[PDB]
From a paper:
The first enzyme in the pathway, peptide O-xylosyltransferase (XT, EC 2.4.2.26), catalyzes the transfer of xylose from uridine diphosphate (UDP)-α-D-xylose onto serine and thus determines the site(s) of GAG attachment on the core protein. XT1 and XT2 are type II transmembrane proteins consisting of a short amino-terminal region facing the cytosol, a single transmembrane helix, a stem region required for Golgi localization (Schön et al., 2006), a catalytic GT-A domain (Lairson et al., 2008, Müller et al., 2006), and a unique C-terminal domain of unknown function, termed “Xylo_C” in the Pfam database (Finn et al., 2008). XT1 has a two-lobed structure, with one lobe comprising the catalytic GT-A domain and the other comprising the Xylo_C domain. To better understand the initial step of GAG biosynthesis, we have determined crystal structures of human XT1 complexed with UDP-xylose and various PG-derived acceptor peptides.
Numbering used by the authors:
A (entry chain A): 253 to 308, 318 to 727, 733 to 959
B (entry chain B): 211 to 219
Amino acid sequence: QPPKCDISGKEAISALSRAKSKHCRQEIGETYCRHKLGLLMPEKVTRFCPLEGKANVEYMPANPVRIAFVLVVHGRASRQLQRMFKAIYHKDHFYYIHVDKRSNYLHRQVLQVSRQYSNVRVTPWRMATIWGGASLLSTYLQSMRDLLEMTDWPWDFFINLSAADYPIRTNDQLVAFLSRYRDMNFLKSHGRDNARFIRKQGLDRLFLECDAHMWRLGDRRIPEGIAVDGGSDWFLLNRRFVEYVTFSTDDLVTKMKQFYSYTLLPAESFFHTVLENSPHCDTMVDNNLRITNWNRKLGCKCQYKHIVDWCGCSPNDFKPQDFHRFQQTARPTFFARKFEAVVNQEIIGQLDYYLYGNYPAGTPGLRSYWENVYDEPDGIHSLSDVTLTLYHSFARLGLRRAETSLHTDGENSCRYYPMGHPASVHLYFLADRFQGFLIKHHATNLAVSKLETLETWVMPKKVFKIDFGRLQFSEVGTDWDAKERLFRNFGGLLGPMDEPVGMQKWGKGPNVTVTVIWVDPVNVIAATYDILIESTAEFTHYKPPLNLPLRPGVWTVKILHHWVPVAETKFLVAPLTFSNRQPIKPEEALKLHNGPLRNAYMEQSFQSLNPVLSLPINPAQVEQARRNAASTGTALEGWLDSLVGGMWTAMDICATGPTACPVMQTCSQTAWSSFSPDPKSELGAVKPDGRLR
Amino acid sequence: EEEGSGGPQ
């Protein structure tokens, strides 16, 4: 269907061209037309504030405030959320949790909490709150309406928190502080030039949310007659102001809700703008009581370009050396961000014991961390062919360990046959060191012919191998996080159609230049290039352009300094046993496992280098790799399992229930199982003082 | 700590 208006704006044509759904293209055109006629955005807004500009703990309160916490959460880190919920809980407060529509695993875990406590509820509606999306404001405004209509919850303050927040002061001080200033609103402004704030936020640009993407559609004017302000979208607002925002029909609230429906990052300026221009303008404190770990040197890399038509930034994760910052006395602060348990748990532990004391001696699991990365109810189609293939292989690696660990000349009662697909997968950390994967899976014990449920721990073999140079480590992976300087593909799981990235980590010293060589499993040199390591460099990384598919097997990456060897590392390109979650067929196996289409991985060749580096190409191994490329079924499974076993180790395996294998422990009795005690994240009965911690 | 999450265009 053609538009109702001629569409000539460059941004809008670029948006229509990139959009994927018919509904989305229609919505884009409708929005553009309405703004074109001047019927979409307000041009002048009434200001009700009489002021000329802006306004700007060890006692026991007689009338303590009751707080409504609004948690907007996403991801997989359910156990870290449980630890934080434990720290902030008191029977007198209220907890309203909105879980991103895309995080069904997390939503199932949150549901178990809301069922235990009468002052904890979950939002029945769920939005896909993408970064910078307009829907974050819709989330807050709807939860405020819900909360104001819950008459059985007489709350006085509104506080929003994410799963990466944590308190840095006790609940008793929070209540005492807010009880003294109960008629104030806590918002932090940008603290710079206002014109530059507007440009950098894109407030003079029109955005539209559709298909989980923020489309930029053109320019717009800032309405006349009001002061525009903004800053952090983390705040604390009292009930009187929430009532005004929710139910007022005056000129200010009505037009601002329309304006901010088509705004990028709306929660960073909507509440600042309304308050300063409203009758409540004299209640504003220019302080949101937060510590945000900004390090714009690392957090501004336009890393959201695939989600929004704009460049964004985000704060860094705290580390142990930052602990002293939580003890400052310059201004009152009660929360901080960000924390990530898979990035650094020590600082979280330091902070929790400092506020609420050590755990009893002998408490297990304090230095460990478990994070679920697959749960059966979400289905194998939510996995990829890569992870499905390798999780199956890890399970088989564990079953072979069990058989070999029993020493007998009679019937081996530790022989198993695998059944179905993995039930769950966990990341396992100990002392902030990644330990590998935990796979829960079903298998038949062949001696008694009975089904058993087991969990297997697999750990990657060390492969980095290192004249006092600067190099400290080298690694290959995918999904490199430039802000946190790590691979988010923790296991380094790779398939033939993946595009690996090589990373190096350097210490201090003078500038140096090094050479990098990539070698495939049959000694073909795929790429060579030199890098400059400046004096101030700490990390370097590069993604070489390799034609796909990559030949399966064990690759090697070498670093040289003027032909002088420095170090090497290895990584695994695993052959796939699945296609569309189905057993791979001969014709699709051959297309995928015989190296890239063009006999060569890049344009320039490096055959001139094989003799120099002592990488001779064995004609027998080349033909065997071709033969391997046509195998399926059992032959292919044996090739994969021989590869995985050479790069991974089955550390241990346990049973969840009764077992006939006499040498396997119960999982709950182990130190490493996701079934073992983890009291720091476990939630029990409310104590006499109203706390869970 | 300056505030605001927007970058540029």
